[PDB]
Ligand binder design. Sequence first.
Ligand SMILES: [Zn+2]
Length: 62
Amino acid sequence: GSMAQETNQTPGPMLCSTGCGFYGNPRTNGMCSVCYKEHLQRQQNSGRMSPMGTASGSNSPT
Ligand SMILES: [Zn+2]
């Protein structure tokens, strides 16, 4: 293996984290075009984002 001009595969396969089978982007949230929209919609609806096991503000009046 003297020469170094043998390209077989490209590095950095930013494949969709959700597993849809399409290419994703690292500038985005690691999701493709479709999944990035659905995911952000669910995150925006929350408002109180805090990944620490528990979360404050979970009341639901009848
Ligand atoms: Zn996707």
